[PDB]
Design a protein around this ligand. Structure first.
Ligand SMILES: Fc1cnccc1-c1ccnc2[nH]ccc12
Length: 154
């Protein structure tokens, strides 16, 4: 009933890396790096793979920080997004035809140009909290209803 996705935030003490997606689903918004998990791959391995594909960066250990389920009314499949963070990467962020990376100071996170749910859970990430969330959307701009709770085990 749900499809697995990953989302990785490279979050360091004073800055966070986001990428502006150029095409496809979510294009035109700043976000972390991620995508669909493949057959025979663990969620964390898929998170690591997608970070490389989309940003050019190599991460070793990833830390689980959240799970968010998205419902888009009128679409049957829920999107089960597993969120991870890291403070330690190798490589320089790469701009490609699919993605434009940029570092942001923590006070300048571009919420108006991000998915609207990020305004709810990104501040929990910044304060090193973990969470379970569920957001029901109509279209890509309107949150009809949501739940969001902090957890000790993701
Ligand atoms: F950007 C996506 C890509 N694939 C699946 C789900 C999302 C998504 C949907 C709604 N809000 C979001 N905030 C951060 C990611 C995200």
């Amino acid at each position: 009933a749900s499809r697995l996705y990953t989302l990785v935030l490279v979050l360091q003490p004073q800055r966070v890396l986001l990428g502006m997606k150029k095409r496809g689903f979510g294009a035109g918004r700043w976000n972390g790096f991620g995508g669909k998990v493949q057959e025979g791959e663990t969620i964390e391995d898929g998170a690591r793979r997608e970070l490389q594909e989309e940003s050019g960066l190599t991460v070793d250990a990833l830390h689980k920080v959240g799970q968010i389920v998205f419902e888009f009314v009128g679409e049957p499949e829920l999107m089960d997004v597993h969120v991870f963070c890291t403070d330690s990467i190798q490589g320089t962020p790469v701009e490609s035809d699919e993605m434009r990376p940029c570092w942001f100071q923590l006070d300048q996170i571009p919420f108006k140009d991000m998915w609207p749910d990020d305004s709810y859970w990104f501040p929990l990430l910044l304060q090193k909290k973990k969470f379970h969330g569920y957001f029901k959307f109509q279209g890509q701009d309107t949150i009809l209803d949501y739940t969001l709770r902090e957890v000790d085990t993701v």
